[PDB]
Amino acid sequence: AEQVAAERAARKAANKEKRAIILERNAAYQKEYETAERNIIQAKRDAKAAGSYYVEAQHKLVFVVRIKGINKIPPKPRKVLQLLRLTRINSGTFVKVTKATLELLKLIEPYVAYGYPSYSTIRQLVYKRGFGKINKQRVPLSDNAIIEANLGKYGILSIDDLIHEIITVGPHFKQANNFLWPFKLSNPSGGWGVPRKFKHFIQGGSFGNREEFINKLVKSMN
């Protein structure tokens, strides 16, 4: 005849069970990451010791940031930017690398800087600027309950489950990445490192594939 304690205690117990599940899942993720990284290092060393060359696997994930404003964009690049959800300068999204998406990045190269995001970069992006689409409602990812309520049907129970599904391009990468609202980054805090942004990174500019330096750029933009 109370219907308060026999609910709050059960909810606290359910929260503790969920937290223990998240804890063990995050520990497993950390083990996975460390093992994969040390296996890449060891494979490179072993190939060198055997007189071979370890050709690392091509990158499956890119982070793309729109570095160009919204004026004077030709229609095909403009449509590709809208389909990659880069509708504003300094907006960023994760793109699973395939032929079909590489030919989009090719079209939008002069308007974006993109590259291969590290785990640290992805984790900091999701922690600080992570927002989800729920009635699309741009909801901040302040609690794991929101992530479970919207992506739990894909087995994603926490913000670290989401980060994992991003970094390792999982079976539900499309749903997790679309649930992620496009990241609204600031201008870089130490500048762009170049006097002019709108030539290719190779030519001393800012746009195009900057493959591993996207992590430094995004960290200074985050």
């Binding site: 494979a43 190939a47 055997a50 007189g51 071979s52 060359y53 370890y54 050709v55 690392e56 696997a57 091509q58 990158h59 499956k60 690398v97 395939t98 032929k99 079909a100 998406t101």
Partner: protein
């Protein structure tokens, strides 16, 4: 593809549980080990200019 998909679905629901019936775009290449046995790398350099006319 329709006929192969029907055949694959039938053989799948007869053999086990796996479908994978959607086409996929060309995926990024997997890691590989490249040997130098009989394939020691040859060093190229840019050639000087000439007219050959």
């Amino acid at each position: 593809r329709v006929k192969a998909n029907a055949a694959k679905r039938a053989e799948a629901k007869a053999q086990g549980v796996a479908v994978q019936l959607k086409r996929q775009p060309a995926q990024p290449r997997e890691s590989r080990i490249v040997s130098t046995e009989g394939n020691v790398p040859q060093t190229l350099a840019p050639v000087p200019y000439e007219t050959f006319i």
